[PDB]
Amino acid sequence: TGRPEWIWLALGTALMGLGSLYFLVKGMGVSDPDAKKFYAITTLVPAIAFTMYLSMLLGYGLTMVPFGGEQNPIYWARYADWLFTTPLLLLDLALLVDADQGTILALVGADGIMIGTGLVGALTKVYSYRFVWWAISTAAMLYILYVLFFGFTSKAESMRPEVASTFKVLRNVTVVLWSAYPVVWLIGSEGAGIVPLNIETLLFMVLDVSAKVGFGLILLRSRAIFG
Numbered sequence: 001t002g003r004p005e006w007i008w009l010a011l012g013t014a015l016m017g018l019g020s021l022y023f024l025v026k027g028m029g030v031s032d033p034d035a036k037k038f039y040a041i042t043t044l045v046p047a048i049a050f051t052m053y054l055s056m057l058l059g060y061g062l063t064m065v066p067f068g069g070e071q072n073p074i075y076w077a078r079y080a081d082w083l084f085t086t087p088l089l090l091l092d093l094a095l096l097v098d099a100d101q102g103t104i105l106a107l108v109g110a111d112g113i114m115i116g117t118g119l120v121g122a123l124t125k126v127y128s129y130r131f132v133w134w135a136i137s138t139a140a141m142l143y144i145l146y147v148l149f150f151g152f153t154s155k156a157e158s159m160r161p162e163v164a165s166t167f168k169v170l171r172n173v174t175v176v177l178w179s180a181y182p183v184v185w186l187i188g189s190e191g192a193g194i195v196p197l198n199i200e201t202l203l204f205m206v207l208d209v210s211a212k213v214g215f216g217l218i219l220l221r222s223r224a225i226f227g
């Protein structure tokens with residue numbers, strides 16, 4: 001098939017795989033129960049991403065959606081990855097600041113809406129309606145980020161500075177990275193079709209790897225994970 005974006009797909013597979021392994025290797029040596037909690041969640045995240053980059057590298061997770069007078073190439077495997085990796089990353093942040101169950105439930109629930117409406121949008125055939133779903137998915141994301149910035153940060157204040165300072169770094173990387181996804185979608189293949197798929201795949205790989213392995217490295221090399 002030889003598509004232009006495959007090299008970016010091979011590179012995402014490689015980074016996710018390696019990252020996952022190292023997390024698994026480091027996770028199975030630790031004995032602290034709480035540290036175990038965090039290690040298992042954080043290793044699972046790039047492990048799911050790896051299997052999906054792999055499938056996409058191999059020709060799966062792609063569909064031609066008609067709109068704008070074109071047969072548009074939409075990588076839906078992406079949302080199958082994010083459906084489970086985005087709430088797991090949220091879970092990691094919540095366990096860190098001892099968020100309440102209702103908060104977690106409501107954050108995981110807003111995240112299901114975001115990915116769900118996002119995919120519906122990336123699958124929608126009436127061009128302008130693609131942006132209506134996109135708009136709702138983004139409002140869901142702004143809800144989640146509001147909660148991470150205003151709620152959590154506040155709770156990380158009952159924690160010790162080492163823990164509060166690790167959370168603020170992960171919160172910052174998360175707000176910066178997640179903010180970028182909706183803009184990539186908008187000017188890329190699912191949206192305006194301004195940025196081509198190969199470049200678009202590159203941006204998504206950089207955001208995904210940063211948000212999973214980048215995030216994981218920061219979290220797991222910290223002392224805040226300990227019970």
Ligand SMILES: *C/C=C(C)/C=C/C=C(C)/C=C/C1=C(C)CCCC1(C)C
Binds near residue numbers: 177
């Ligand atoms: C490992 C993956 C991460 C941290 C993915 C984050 C993905 C997002 C924040 C995605 C957001 C989207 C929107 C706000 C609207 C349009 C569609 C999405 C799903 C790309």
